[PDB]
């Protein structure tokens, strides 16, 4: 029921990262967003390994809440929200900072 998808990306394996928290799809700030974070996302979606982790709303801007920020994944986590971060709904971003991924399974 805590879910994740990629949107405005062209296939399911690349897009803006969004997370279903408490009935709402919300976004992820790009502040420490790297390919370790994007691997956790790609692995958790079954899209494999990450080819990049673009910041600056490269797949546009969400209009939900911003649900995660300062994500600092070791790389071995199952789910993005199990990584270290500043806690649910704690962020210092706007949606222009929304984080995205491209995965291997993207065409």
Author numbering: 7 to 113
Give excerpts from the publication.
The scavenger receptors usually consist of one or more repeats of the scavenger receptor cysteine-rich domain (SRCRD) protein, which is an ancient and highly conserved protein module comprising about 110 residues. SRCRD proteins have been classified into two types based on the number of cysteine residues; Type A proteins are encoded by two exons and contain six cysteine residues, whereas Type B proteins typically contain eight cysteines and are encoded by one exon. SALSA, which is also as known as deleted in malignant brain tumors 1 (DMBT1) and salivary agglutinin (SAG), is a member of the scavenger receptor family that was thought to be involved in the oral clearance of microorganisms because of its bacterial agglutination properties. This protein contains 14 Type B SRCRDs separated by SRCR-interspersed domains (SIDs).
Our initial attempt to produce the protein included fusing a Trx tag at the N terminus of the sequence, to increase the solubility of the recombinant protein, followed by digestion with TEV protease, to obtain purified SRCRD. However, the proteins obtained contained aggregates, thus requiring further refolding. Therefore, further refolding was performed using the GSH/GSSG redox system, for the formation of appropriate disulfide bonds by the cysteines of SRCRD. However, the final yield of the purified protein was not high, probably because of the tedious steps and inadequate digestion process. More than 1 month after the SRCRD protein was purified and refolded from supernatant expression, a few protein crystals were finally detected in the reservoir solution containing lithium citrate tribasic tetrahydrate and polyethylene glycol 3,350. Noodle-shaped crystals formed in the condition with 0.2 M lithium citrate tribasic tetrahydrate, 25%–30% w/v polyethylene glycol 3,350, pH 6.0–7.0. However, the crystallization of SRCRD prepared using this purification and refolding strategy was not very reproducible, and crystals did not always grow. Although crystals were finally obtained, the crystallization could not be stably repeated. The highest resolution of the noodle-shaped crystal obtained here was determined to be 2.54 Å, and one asymmetric unit contained one molecule. The space group of the noodle-shaped crystal was determined to be P 32 2 1, with unit cell parameters of a = 71.08 Å, b = 71.08 Å, and c = 55.36 Å.
